Design a protein around this ligand. Structure first.
Ligand SMILES: CCC(CC)CN(C[C@@H](O)[C@H](Cc1ccccc1)NC(=O)O[C@H]1CO[C@H]2OCC[C@H]21)S(=O)(=O)c1ccc(N)cc1
Lengths: 99, 99
């Protein structure tokens, strides 16, 4: 679908068998979700935003469905202000910017 | 044009007679640019993201040209690591997400 930007581009995602709201964020290299219990192994990593760096748990090769589109990639879990879908997954669902 | 997301969506912009590179950021509510000396009045503001908040200067009715598309609106200026074009100006250039 085509999404205009008058409102935040929020969509429903399905990760680990749970539905969640997430922001499509072309300014994010990586996907970062709020604190949650995910199955599988994870490694501690650091990521930096506009206001500094935070500690996150890195889950690799996680299945995540975004508006009925399947992706399998890296998902970071930590104290992000909001669930964001970054380019690592936006590329997988075929997302482009157009103007 | 159509911008894929394999790499950061960086484009050339023109503001206050200066050319800069900036990120087309659907996750940013408002445009925030690196520290620069813009004339005119401004209002202090704080904006939040990963890592916390930064203090910025809010300028209103600022003209920016993005890839030849003109747009006028709020421009925040502060210690951001990257120039960010946010939804407030992305809507004005007819920019959409598509997948
Ligand atoms: C509240 C929703 C997001 C943060 C979650 C808002 N951000 C825009 C976002 O695109 C930001 C924009 C951004 C890009 C690059 C450096 C700092 C900020 N990218 C970002 O934080 O991405 C992180 C996750 O992927 C990684 O790649 C980029 C950093 C990591 S922001 O920078 O903090 C921001 C907040 C308010 C305004 N008005 C303008 C920008």
């Amino acid at each position: 679908p085509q999404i205009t930007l008058w409102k935040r581009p929020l969509v429903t995602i399905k990760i680990g068998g749970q539905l969640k709201e997430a922001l499509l964020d072309t300014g994010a290299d990586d996907t970062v979700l709020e604190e949650m219990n995910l199955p599988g192994r994870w490694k501690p990593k650091m990521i930096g935003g506009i206001g500094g760096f935070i500690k996150v748990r890195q889950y690799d090769q996680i299945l995540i469905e975004i508006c009925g589109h399947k992706a399998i990639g890296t998902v970071l879990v930590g104290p992000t202000p909001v669930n964001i879908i970054g380019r690592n997954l936006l590329t997988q669902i075929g997302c482009t910017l157009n103007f």
